[PDB]
Amino acid sequence: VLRDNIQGITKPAIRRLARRGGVKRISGLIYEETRGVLKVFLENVIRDAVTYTEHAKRKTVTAMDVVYALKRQGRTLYGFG
Amino acid sequence: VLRDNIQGITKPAIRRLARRGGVKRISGLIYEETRGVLKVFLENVIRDAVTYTEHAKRKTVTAMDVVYALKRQGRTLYGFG
Amino acid sequence: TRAKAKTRSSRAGLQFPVGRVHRLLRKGNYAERVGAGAPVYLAAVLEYLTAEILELAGNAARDNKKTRIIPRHLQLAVRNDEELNKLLGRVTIAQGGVLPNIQSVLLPKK
Amino acid sequence: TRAKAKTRSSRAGLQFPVGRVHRLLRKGNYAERVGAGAPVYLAAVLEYLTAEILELAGNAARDNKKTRIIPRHLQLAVRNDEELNKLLGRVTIAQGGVLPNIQSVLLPKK
Amino acid sequence: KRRKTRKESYAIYVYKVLKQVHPDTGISSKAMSIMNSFVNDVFERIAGEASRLAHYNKRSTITSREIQTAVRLLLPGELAKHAVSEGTKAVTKYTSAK
Amino acid sequence: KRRKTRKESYAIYVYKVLKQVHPDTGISSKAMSIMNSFVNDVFERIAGEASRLAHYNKRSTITSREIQTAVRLLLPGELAKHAVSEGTKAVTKYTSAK
Amino acid sequence: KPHRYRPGTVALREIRRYQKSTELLIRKLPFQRLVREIAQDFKTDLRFQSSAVMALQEASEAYLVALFEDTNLCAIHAKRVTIMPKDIQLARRIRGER
Amino acid sequence: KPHRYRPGTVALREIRRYQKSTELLIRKLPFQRLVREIAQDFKTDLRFQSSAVMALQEASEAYLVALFEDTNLCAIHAKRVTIMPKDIQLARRIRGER
DNA sequence: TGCACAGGATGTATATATCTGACACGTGCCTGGAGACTAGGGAGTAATCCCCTTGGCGGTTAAAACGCGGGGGACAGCGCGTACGTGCGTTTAAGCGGTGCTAGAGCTGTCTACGACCAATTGAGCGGCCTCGGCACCGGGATTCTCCAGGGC
DNA sequence: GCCCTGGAGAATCCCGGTGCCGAGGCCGCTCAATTGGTCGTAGACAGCTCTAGCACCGCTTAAACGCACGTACGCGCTGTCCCCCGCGTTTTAACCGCCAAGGGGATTACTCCCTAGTCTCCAGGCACGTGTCAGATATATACATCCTGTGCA
């Protein structure tokens, strides 16, 4: 059982993401907000991917499941089949 | 041949729309911007609707042509078939 | 002689038409084949969603002292229910209007 | 004797597979029937869009002194071309990065 | 004396469902048109998702479990679980009948 | 021992088009995967729109006309007019040949 | 001596009134002339069903009302109570329209 | 007196660096643990393909970066250079995610 | 005394040399696309009908346009304090490379039961057709809300 | 002098009577759903292979973390002024009701040509090998840039 892995999304990593997003200056309260945002996003995507996986009667979440879930949420991904 | 009909979307009409949108105070420059926005929106929808009409070899834009255009642009509209 | 005809809706206990849903699935270019339980399932789901929207809309109509659902009541039902409002998030209901919502900063400083 | 086989892609003067596109149309559950010109038209369009993207991406690869197109070059091509950026507006290219855009209000004062 | 062509809709079934949930409540024709386009919209959403599920899994048949996975994908949460409950109850009752 | 089951892609066709537009430029496996998914995505969009067009007009057949209208609905502006010209040219050449 | 409401009382009154109501807020005939003028550029001698014109007006007004809601949020974010063109532009940029 | 860049020089340098590069910006093992932990709530004993985790990370990072761009716009709109949670919340509200 | 270079430190762009693994190309083979037909129904076409779109016209009035105070909100400036950026030393786990094990993905062969199909039958649903009561409307009175002018602390 | 009541005045709501037109029920009828068999293949299932996912472990070092310091940015406060609101008046054209013409949507009938289906055959395309060169990686260097102090008009 895994626990408290959202803290693995560290402040330096969030800062790097913000830099690629063009942000020059980051308030200290951004990091928890961003961890919550990322958690919500991943919950939606992973719920749909596991739905696709269970429908196929597999136990392994595949890249194709993830791609289909992203497509269903209007976030088409290229480069994984 | 019609012309200059965007001015038929009057300043009080735009104010009523903004009131339904909950807006309390309206810059005087908002009205030209709103006209431009509405014209862009109508151009997209009507281009799609007339494409449907031409494909059907019709000369009359139908409510279904409008509804299909809107649904294609992700703005589904109930109440017109 | 042939047995008395029973609608599949009656066998399923549904008000929505199972045979019509079956034909709409078959003639809809969805799959080469349509299983027997797929129209029953889909009609049950459609009847349930209709019942949800109509229950909330009848409540909204009674709140306005009307005995007849109008698009306004449909809109008030949809936008006030969180999950129905998520389902119909990209949908415009004609003659539905909007939810009464004034931002608190716009209210007079009383 | 039968005639020497000639691909439908060669008759249409294309590089994209007209026969394979025809099969994918027939077996994709799009309609009951597929006309003979539909796969030809679709292969021509797919080939045109491919050539557009590849032309822009080869320019972008050359502008980095590279000889092989990579996802970064594809992303640069797409996000720099206005209509391709509109067509792929809600598409994410893996390993594509972003465009180098800094808001001018963030730059140092001279 | 040209009789109009037959146009199918869900209006009668919407009216039956309404008489179940609110017996002393009617519905205007505009609201009924909205309800009809809602039933059609949701039908198309679920049917399209079941269609591409069957295609993803290289199946030829849309079955009750394709419809169920489509419902679980498209509906938000509690709606999805109550809808799955209603659907499986209906399929069980239909199978027991005939 | 046994060869993997064959999996069709558009890679050789994308590569032919690449050797047409940039005779000296190559492409990585990841960029080719992106190109393949792009072709599949555009195919799906155009075929879905052409399917819907045939349905709205109560037709059984997807024809060049449906495909062309789908292209005009899906592509923005100049891309649409150029794609239409390419399609009509290819169909004219195909029917003139056989 | 003449009675005057303060600047914002009547604006809030109108907000409440127009959020209670559901009728269209643009004049039908000007909107219809606008639609026909816009369609002239796509195809000449076009005709419109009355229901087509009305569907267009419903869509347009719904779009503008939602846009004004987002614009109001943008203006309040910048510590104002007055919506400005830059608020509209920001809302449309965040949505992904410009 | 040791060298110090002024507060924003290294920030702009980082912006240029990371908008130039394409590599992922979150650590792969922490992200994988996060994914597996989230998926535990939907089904027990799930396995993941390496490419499934990589696709999740590509999508997550693209989403977070685009969100940060919208957030930066909303912070500039309020005449700030510092992004704040209110900026993030406004961006996600206008997008239609809240 | 506040403003522009000197130069120093720092970072980055740029040849230059190594090296390697992924790309491009060649080979074998097999399956799916082409060629050559036939059958039948989808659709192209012509004729016809009627409906519903357009065009006009005149009267009424709601609404738009306009102008005019005036207040309150936008915005610019200024000050202050704290919170974020930069940099530095310490810690810690990520990454990497290997080894090992087995769960389950993926394929194959059987076979059956489920769905397409088809023909006959009939009632569910649709159009049409009244018809009355729910709602719109109108007017009038009660209630609530806004606001400022003066009384009082 | 600033603020709390307290009436005016306006707006909104609540009641009640009118009247109409659309919801709702009813009646033929027809066409689509149901019944009842037939069949052939899609898929369920069992067995088997071997891919790749999981688990672990040691090591190296890149990245995270914690901390200190200062500065520049966020934010609150103040003042001005101008621009937008509220409102009374005049003007305009929307709206409504009605009439009339005919363009074209919609339907029907028919006929043919275009597409599905089949079968045969082979070559295009896929999996698999393989070698070399484009790019990744140091590595040293030449800038290009930032920042502060300093000299000076």
Automatic annotation (TrEMBL), chains C, D:
Q: Where is the Histone H2A C-terminal domain?
A: 82-110
Which residue ranges have biased composition labelled Basic residues?
1-9
Q: Which UniProt keywords apply?
A: Acetylation, Chromosome, DNA-binding, Isopeptide bond, Nucleosome core, Nucleus, Phosphoprotein, Ubl conjugation
User: Chief localization class?
Assistant: nucleus
Query: Gene Ontology terms, cellular component aspect?
Result: nucleosome; nucleus
Q: Where is the Core Histone H2A/H2B/H3 domain?
A: 1-79
Give the GO molecular function terms: DNA binding; protein heterodimerization activity; structural constituent of chromatin
Keyword Acetylation carried by entry: yes
Q: Which family does it belong to?
A: Belongs to the histone H2A family.
Q: What does this protein do?
A: Core component of nucleosome. Nucleosomes wrap and compact DNA into chromatin, limiting DNA accessibility to the cellular machineries which require DNA as a template. Histones thereby play a central role in transcription regulation, DNA repair, DNA replication and chromosomal stability. DNA accessibility is regulated via a complex set of post-translational modifications of histones, also called histone code, and nucleosome remodeling.
What's the subunit arrangement here? Answer: The nucleosome is a histone octamer containing two molecules each of H2A, H2B, H3 and H4 assembled in one H3-H4 heterotetramer and two H2A-H2B heterodimers. The octamer wraps approximately 147 bp of DNA.
Protein name as it appears in the record: Histone H2A
Organism in which the protein naturally occurs: Xenopus laevis
Residue numbers of the full-length protein present here:
11 to 120 of 130
